[PDB]
Design brief:
Chains A, B: Ca(2+) binds at residues 659, 687, 691. The structure is a homodimer of 725-residue chains. In chain A, the strands form 2 sheets. Chain A has a two-stranded antiparallel sheet with strand order 1-2. Chain A has a two-stranded antiparallel sheet with strand order 3-4. In chain A, helix 7 runs antiparallel to helix 8 (279-308). Chain A has one domain (1-725). Chain A is an all-alpha fold and 725 residues long. The longest helix of chain A is centred in the last third of the chain and has 43 residues, at 477-519. Chain A has helices at 2-25, 32-70, 73-111, 114-150, 153-156, 170-211, 224-264, 279-308, 316-342, 360-383, 388-395, 401-414, 417-446, 450-472, 477-519, 530-533, 541-582, 595-609, 611-628, 630-666, 678-719; strands at 160-161, 167-168, 266-268, 273-275. The first copy, chain A, is globular, with a radius of gyration of 25 Å. At the A-B interface, helix 6, helix 12, helix 13, helix 15 and helix 17 of A face helix 6, helix 12, helix 13, helix 15 and helix 17 of B. The structure holds magnesium ion (10 copies) and sodium ion (2 copies).
Chain lengths: 725, 725
């Protein structure tokens, strides 16, 4: 059937990724010295990611076994699968970037043009994007085919009850396991890599620029290699796992909602249950987001393929925007026909929230897509120095450091309102068209072109690394200016991707609130009306107290991450000072600095600290649940969603703005004052403040929300009646 | 009756305030220079507060008229009354502090002991505390006696419906007007004063300390007078209006809840309304928080008098802590007998949430008190340099400025979890004992000794001013050390007071959620069960979207305040640079700097910016309500409560910790590095970052929550059915 043809699409995506890999590795590579340093970075990155992968997969096996014990084994299986998929996305991403980075450098060096570097960098990110979409939908469609069709978990869709008292739906619990795996792995990865790269970058930039008057990425600085290796580890793999888990999060959210919808919407007539919605419609609504995601992936492929070729323009940001726009538009247009034809005659839609026929989920999809796009636009507005706010931030450096920090935090706080409002109208309209299912599908719509988003976002770290390499070998300033252009653009794309992630996370979070309320239902209370189930009252003390708690947990989470960064950051600062002092000829370029120490500090600290956050995210709903019940947990999830929603956008836009303001002054756009000036130092301090926020605190929330909510959805059946207080 | 005797108590409080005023003003003024500078500061402060009071009272008259039009005239009357009360608290506070600071300075100069300065400063704050409690309970009891007893608005307590379709309860609407007045005035005052003092302080500290190597509060600096005048305007009057409005907020919250409880708790038996709770019980529960607050005031008076007459010890923090502890304890003990005797035989307790007899609200009160105290303890822990976190923050300055900022924000975020948890258990337990009424009374309990809290908190600005004056006139360093001690202590007390404020604000916010749900009921819908009324479903799209929006509004609010500060801050920085450049002999102490310009900048900017925030706080529930209904507004209130709860504590504790870390290094507690070193500059920058956060952003939230929630509670009856979408 056509099903197999759609099953080909992720495989074609993987093939495209491998093709781009081959195309980029084909590049001639700059210099033997460049190859050497790049090989060093490869060694460090591969090492750290190896230790990471080891520990995280150990923990993943443990958790998976625990799931197979306390739930269905299919849960643990899908868990391991998704784990492998996300981890593989990370590994492929890094292994690609580490080799891809040199090509950009040589391109900009020889051609002295932005075009080539832009192209190779874009292909570099493309590999990772296609890897993300491909892996996600591959694992997903594997779960779907194997567990849903062969085992017939989509067949029954009735409320079950295994031992220990957990009320579950087989397929729902399975995909729950999948998404949970993805979330845990993503969290571990990006926390570790995050702390690593941010400690390294903070120390390097701070001491190097402000305490030694060294240029950015100077080989005299023993911390620069740590910065680049960190860029390869954190800003890359973490992003892949992140947006993969966000994509999966949205789709699996839709699937769970749809699946739980069927056995619940019964009408109790004289002790007889009457299914108000037929099984066929439900199954169709279960398969719908998968085929959706496949089509979206395809369109993303069309867009990316169109871009990597094409007549290269002198403006990269415009090109990437064209990529996203074309991918999104194609996605919309094809989704129209997909939605119309697939859901043509089901008749049972009117009962479960469909207002305007069967074209409703396409409308909700459009809502999600347009929402994501607007988020991108706003993010770019607040972070790029081509506009007012970042220009003001950079220009404000004349007044001091305190002004940089203050106006930075202010910018962060102000930049919250537009995408949040966009999300509000998004939720309201999606709910208007197709209700909760509409919201769940809108979450997917925002990330329907996840491949292009991940690509455009991953385009940045390659540029940053290319700059780091360009500075180390003392090249023509054309290389540095081009690479700085690409790097600033990348910094914008990061903020954009973050916005997408947190938005989709929020829609999916609402849908997961719905599913969470559904999951509480036992086979005995199957007759209860849907309206009485979907009820999470704020005036209940446990619920609002829950919200407050969850909020505080999010904030303390952020604080813990920041502290974790500042530890190795400080230690490395002291290390840089000590090396600059005790090594003669180091600052004169007549003595090679000890990079391995700087590597060791952040590596050790990251490996040590990385454990706690994920464990907290997993155990919180458990302990709060067993202590105070399900309502309290619902509250916790709410507060978490809100506070995470705010802090993510804040940190993202603020950090991006700070960095791009630094790069703004570094481009000499501010008259008189330059790289060695005091305002430059102020913007540098600002950037070092924004670093642990934008690349460690921000996304960790968008993961934490989904993992915590899914854990809650799964475990709720236990402490719903087995709560202590 | 005994009622008149209790009505005497606030008058005795005012008398005590006047007595302390006379006692302190009798103290000797140091030197003609001190008198001159103090007269200057007095002139500036009185001027700014005059303009402020003028504009704010114009707006207040307008709003009051609007209330008299669209609601009962009693609403507008009580509005004006409360307005006058809060404003008067501010005016008295400032007018007292401005004179007290010299007494403190001269005391520390002559005696070279901590005791005297501590005592006179404490009496200085005492005047303001007694002014706050006194004014609040005076206006409140005036409303009670006049509108409740003479007019008989406590008599009817039936659901009414005036023109325009607003369903109201007379007394409830009245005290709503009262609290609203207090909130609007407090907001205006502390926003204006906040921006004023913070721009000045930021510029002064930054340029003075780090760019000129000048000592803090050096007369060579043209911005120091602006800083001191600001301390008198912002940190004083703003605090008075703030905590007065918080006190009033809690009490009026209880009153509104209790009042609305009667016509709502009817049982519909065959088209017949059956009051499940008698009127006597309801009225008793209405009077209860007032007499509660009166007793608390009395106990506060006992504590304060005990301290001011006590034998002065070399340790101030211990003395203030003893004050708070004794006040709280006395409050508890007397409240026990009050609660037992007053609520002896009411019969209606079992129906409306009272679990353990009639002693329940005393238990909830104890919960609130202990909660507030614990908040104080945690605040002191995180902010004082006598403990680990602030010490680490100060010591971290060796690693750079970015580390100071990062660890500061980290401290802020981490310090959120303990008092939030305290508030969670507080809410849960209060609800366990006496439900929503329990929570509402707990809000009062936390601030039962509001006089002592305001006193202890206001003790600080006087000390800070004493230090500024001592430095300006070039005195013995022992004076500076004493005043620095007292000032750091003051900085701790500030954080404590903020914690109290936001806590009480949150409890009262829950109770106001309840009252908000109550207010929607029309006379036709009077028969509806209480359980179905108290329902705010999160899964409703409007509600969660509301939460997101409100959250974003809180964040953008904070951002706007920060920006407003940074405007005049930057302008003043440029002014200081310009004066230092163009005025010869300025830095040599041979030319008097132009302070009036620095005054003018912050004055103009503050007067300009102060308008918007209050207007937003008032208009948001209106526009969002008319647009999307009552549920959406409920959501907005939720998100507002949560985000405000987090940001307030964050900014407060972070700012306090930063400041006391600066003071920690300035005391030479960090070996080797001193006032002129680079780590000192780092801590200075950190302090300038924390300044606009803790003294402009923080409390503004605790006001915004209550003003917005009250406005919503009042206006809800209109757009509940006259909503556009
Ligand atoms: Mg950097
Ligand atoms: Mg980097
Ligand atoms: Mg770099
Ligand atoms: Mg960057
Ligand atoms: Mg950085
Ligand atoms: Mg200061
Ligand atoms: Mg001050
Ligand atoms: Mg001062
Ligand atoms: Mg201070
Ligand atoms: Mg300050
Ligand atoms: Na994610
Ligand atoms: Na207040």
């Amino acid at each position: 059937y056509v099903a197999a043809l759609f099953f080909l699409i992720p495989l074609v995506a993987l093939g495209f990724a491998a093709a781009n890999f081959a195309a980029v590795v084909r590049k001639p590579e700059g210099t033997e010295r460049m190859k050497e340093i790049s090989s060093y970075i490869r060694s460090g990155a591969d090492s750290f990611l190896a230790h990471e992968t080891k520990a995280i997969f150990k923990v993943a096996i443990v958790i998976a076994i625990l799931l197979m014990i306390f739930t269905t084994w299919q849960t643990g299986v899908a868990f391991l699968l998704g784990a492998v998929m996300s981890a593989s996305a990370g590994i492929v991403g890094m292994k690609m970037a580490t080799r891809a980075n040199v090509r950009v450098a040589e391109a900009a060096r020889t051609t002295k043009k932005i075009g080539p570097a832009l192209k190779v960098a874009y292909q570099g990110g493309s590999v990772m994007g296609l890897s993300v979409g491909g892996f996600a939908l591959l694992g997903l469609v594997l779960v779907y085919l194997i567990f849903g069709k062969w085992m017939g978990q989509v067949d029954n869709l009735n409320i079950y009850t295994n031992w220990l008292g957990i009320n579950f739906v087989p397929f729902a619990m399975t995909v729950s396991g999948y998404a949970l795996g993805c979330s845990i792995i993503a969290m571990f990865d990006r926390v570790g890599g995050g702390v690593y790269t941010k400690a390294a970058d903070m120390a390097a930039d701070l001491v190097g620029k402000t305490e030694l008057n060294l240029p950015e990425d100077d080989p005299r600085n023993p911390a620069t290699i740590a910065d680049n290796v960190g860029d390869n580890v954190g800003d890359v793999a973490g992003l892949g796992a992140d947006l993969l888990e966000s994509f999966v999060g949205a789709i699996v959210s839709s699937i769970i909602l749809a699946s739980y919808m069927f056995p619940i919407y019964v009408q109790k007539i004289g002790e007889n249950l009457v299914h108000q919605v037929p099984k066929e419609t439900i199954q169709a609504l279960i398969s719908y987001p998968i085929f959706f995601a496949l089509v979206g992936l395809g369109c993303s492929m069309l867009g990316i393929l169109y871009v990597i070729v094409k007549k290269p323009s002198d403006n990269p940001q415009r090109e990437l925007n064209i990529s996203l726009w074309t991918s999104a538009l194609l996605t919309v247009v094809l989704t129209a026909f997909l939605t119309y034809f697939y859901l043509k005659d089901l008749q049972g839609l009117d009962v479960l929230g469909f207002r305007f026929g069967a074209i409703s989920p396409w409308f909700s999809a459009i809502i999600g897509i347009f929402s994501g796009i607007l988020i991108g636009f706003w993010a770019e507005y607040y972070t790029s120095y081509r506009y007012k706010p970042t220009q003001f931030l950079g220009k404000s450096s004349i007044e001091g450091t305190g002004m940089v920090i203050s106006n930075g935090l202010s910018l962060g706080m102000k930049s919250v309102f537009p995408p949040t409002l966009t999300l509000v109208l998004g939720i309201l309209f999606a709910d208007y068209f197709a209700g909760l299912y509409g919201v769940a599908i809108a979450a997917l719509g925002m990330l329907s072109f996840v491949a292009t988003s991940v690509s455009v976002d991953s385009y940045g770290p390659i540029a940053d690394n290319a700059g780091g390499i360009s500075e180390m070998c003392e090249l023509d300033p054309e290389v540095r200016k081009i690479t700085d252009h690409l790097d600033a653009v990348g910094n914008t794309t990061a903020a954009i991707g973050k916005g997408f992630a947190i938005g989709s996370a929020i829609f999916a979070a609402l849908s997961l609130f719905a599913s969470y309320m559904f999951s509480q239902i036992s086979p005995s209370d199957i007759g209860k009306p849907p309206s009485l189930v979907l009820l999470l009252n704020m005036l209940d003390a446990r619920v609002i107290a829950g919200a407050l708690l969850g909020a505080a947990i999010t904030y303390y989470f952020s604080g813990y991450l920041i502290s974790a960064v500042t530890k190795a950051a400080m230690k490395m600062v002291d290390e840089i000072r000590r090396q600059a002092r005790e090594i003669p000829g180091l600052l004169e370029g007549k003595a090679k600095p000890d990079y391995n120490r700087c590597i060791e500090i952040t590596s050790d600290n990251a490996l040590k600290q990385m454990g706690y956050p994920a464990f907290i995210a997993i155990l919180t709903p458990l302990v709060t649940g067993f202590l105070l019940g399900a309502e309290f947990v619902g509250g916790v999830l709410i507060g978490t969603v809100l506070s995470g929603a705010m802090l993510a956008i804040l940190t993202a836009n603020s950090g991006g703005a700070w960095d791009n303001a630094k790069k703004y002054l570094e481009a000499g756009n501010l008259e008189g004052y330059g790289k060695g000036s005091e305002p430059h130092k102020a913007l540098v301090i600002g950037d070092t403040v924004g670093d642990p926020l934008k690349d460690t605190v921000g996304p960790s929330l968008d993961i934490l929300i989904k993992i915590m909510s899914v854990v809650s959805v799964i475990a709720v059946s236990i402490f719903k009646h087995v709560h202590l207080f």
